[PDB]
Structure 1
Amino acid sequence: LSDADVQKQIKHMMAFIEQEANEKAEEIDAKAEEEFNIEKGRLVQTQRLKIMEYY
């Protein structure tokens, strides 16, 4: 055995951990962008409905 082999071995696992975590973080960014656009399509739609009512 060798502690270098230990480092590579554990880095397989750290690769999995960090990469899944950061892929989900990128999904959180996808939320911040497109789910933000969806909350726009909802709330601004209600605002626009208000303005038709008023007109």
Structure 2
Amino acid sequence: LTPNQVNDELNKMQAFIRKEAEEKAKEIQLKADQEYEIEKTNIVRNETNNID
């Protein structure tokens, strides 16, 4: 009924959605960096053993 409650709830919902999207993007970037690091480390270890 009031006009301030829709703006306050929409601003809090938008800020919480933006923070959740930023945290999910940071977690996805960290998981992709860790998976790329292990995926490089395995083939680097195998190629280093074969070259050794």
Question: How would you bin the TM-score normalised by the shorter chain?
Answer: 0.5 to 0.7
Misfit runs of 4+, over 4 Å:
none
Which residue of structure 2 lines up, in the alignment, with residue 45 of structure 1?
45
Aligned identity (percent) is 39
Which residue of structure 2 lines up, in the alignment, with residue 14 of structure 1?
14
Q: Which letter maps to 1:30?
A: L
TM (normalized to structure 2)? 0.68
Task: Tell me how far apart the structure 2 counterparts of residues 8 and 38 of structure 1 sit (CA, whole Å).
Answer: 45
Task: Tell me how far apart the structure 2 counterparts of residues 13 and 22 of structure 1 sit (CA, whole Å).
Answer: 14
RMSD across aligned C-alpha pairs, in angstroms? 1.7
Which structure 1 segments of 5+ residues have no match? none
Aligned length: 51
